[PDB]
C-alpha cells in the first residue's frame, strides 16, 4: 500500500514474519516492525542460543574486523534475517532493505499508532501448544545485548500511558452508546436504512 505497515513483533515467529516482511518490502512497501524483543523462535531456548553461539563462532580468522558482523540487538537480528531473505547485493534488494525499519520496544513515532498482526507468522496458530520456544529478547540479552532492562522500563511506561488512553477511549465509547440511546427518535430513520443494507446489525 501507500502508507507504512506497522507490525507488532510480539508473538510472531522469526522466519515467518521475516519472509512476509521481505516480500512486502520487495513489493515496494514501507514496513516498520516494532517490539522486536517479543519475537519468538520455535525450538527450546538452549538450542536457539547454541545456534546463535555458532553464528558468533563464524568469524574471519585473518581479520575479524572484516568478518561477519554479529548484531546483538533483537531489531538488528530480525533485520539480518530479512536481509538473508532479500537479494541484498543488488540495487533492488538494497532499496527493499531501505524500505524496512526495525525497533526494540515501540518508539514515539509509532507508539501512538495502531499496529498490525500477521496471523500466518503468529506463534499461537503456527506452533503446537506443547512445543518449546525462545524469546528473541532473552536470547539477545544473554548473547550480548545491553539494553534489555532500559527497554523493559520504557515499555512499562508506554504501557501505563496506553492504559490511560484506553480508559479515556472506553469512556468516550460508553458516552457514545449513551448518546445513541438518548437520540433514537431522530435516528431510527437512518438506522433502518443501515440495518436494511447490512451495516449495524
Amino acid at each position: 500500500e501507500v502508507q507504512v505497515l506497522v507490525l507488532d513483533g510480539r508473538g510472531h515467529l522469526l522466519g515467518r514474519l521475516a519472509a512476509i516482511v521481505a516480500k512486502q518490502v520487495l513489493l515496494g512497501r514501507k514496513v516498520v516492525v516494532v517490539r522486536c524483543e517479543g519475537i519468538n523462535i520455535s525450538g527450546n531456548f538452549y538450542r536457539n542460543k547454541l545456534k546463535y553461539l555458532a553464528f558468533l563462532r563464524k568469524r574471519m580468522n585473518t581479520n575479524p574486523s572484516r568478518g561477519p558482523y554479529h548484531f546483538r540487538a533483537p531489531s538488528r537480528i530480525f533485520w539480518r534475517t530479512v536481509r538473508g531473505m532479500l537479494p541484498h547485493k543488488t540495487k533492488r534488494g538494497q532499496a527493499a532493505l531501505d524500505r524496512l525499519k526495525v525497533f526494540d520496544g515501540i518508539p514515539p513515532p509509532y507508539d501512538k499508532k495502531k499496529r498490525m498482526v500477521v496471523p500466518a507468522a503468529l506463534k499461537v496458530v503456527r506452533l503446537k501448544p506443547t512445543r518449546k520456544f525462545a524469546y528473541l529478547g532473552r536470547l539477545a540479552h544473554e548473547v550480548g545485548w545491553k539494553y534489555q532492562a532500559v527497554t523493559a522500563t520504557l515499555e512499562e511506561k508506554r504501557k501505563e500511558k496506553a492504559k490511560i488512553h484506553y480508559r479515556k477511549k472506553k469512556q468516550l465509547m460508553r458516552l457514545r452508546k449513551q448518546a445513541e440511546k438518548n437520540v433514537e427518535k431522530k435516528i431510527d430513520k437512518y438506522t433502518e436504512v443501515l440495518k436494511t443494507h447490512g451495516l449495524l446489525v
Binding site: 448518546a179 435516528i187 430513520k189 436504512v193 443494507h197
Partner: protein, 139 residues
C-alpha cells in the same frame, strides 16, 4: 471451560466446503476427524464430513446415534431449529454480511447519506453530553 461439544444430535454450522452456509446435525462420529452428518430440513443428505469445516452451535437434538432420516427430521422439525437459528444473533450477522455484500451502487450512496446524517446527529449529542459532564466542581 468448554461449553459446546461434538456429540450425537449437536447442530453444527458449515463454514466451508460444498455445503457452506448450512445447518447440519451430527448423527455419528468417525475416527476423530469425521462425522456422519445429516441435514434433513436444510437440504444436506447424509454423508461424512470433517470436523474442520464445522462450527458447533448451541442446539442439541435428541435422537439415538445412527438413526434414520425420519427420526432426525422429526427431531429437527419439533422444536424447529430453522426459526430458532434465524432468531439467533449468529445467523442475523451472517444475513447482514450477505446483504452488505449484495449492496449496489445506489444503495451504497443512500447508505452513505444516511450514515452521514446519523453520525452527525450522534456526534452533536456526544458533544452535548461532554459539555454537560464537564460542569463538575465539588471539593
Amino acid at each position: 471451560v468448554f461449553r459446546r461439544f461434538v456429540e450425537v444430535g449437536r447442530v453444527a454450522y458449515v463454514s466451508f466446503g460444498p455445503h457452506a452456509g448450512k445447518l447440519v446435525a451430527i448423527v455419528d462420529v468417525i475416527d476423530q476427524n469425521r462425522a456422519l452428518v445429516d441435514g434433513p430440513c436444510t437440504q444436506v443428505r447424509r454423508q461424512a464430513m470433517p470436523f474442520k469445516c464445522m462450527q458447533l452451535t448451541d442446539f442439541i437434538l435428541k435422537f439415538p446415534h445412527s438413526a434414520h432420516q425420519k427420526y432426525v427430521r422429526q427431531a429437527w422439525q419439533k422444536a424447529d431449529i430453522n426459526t430458532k437459528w434465524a432468531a439467533t444473533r449468529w445467523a442475523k450477522k451472517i444475513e447482514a454480511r450477505e446483504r452488505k455484500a449484495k449492496m449496489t451502487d445506489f444503495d451504497r450512496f443512500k447508505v452513505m447519506k444516511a450514515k452521514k446524517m446519523r453520525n452527525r446527529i450522534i456526534k452533536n449529542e456526544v458533544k452535548k453530553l461532554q459539555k454537560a459532564a464537564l460542569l463538575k466542581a465539588s471539593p
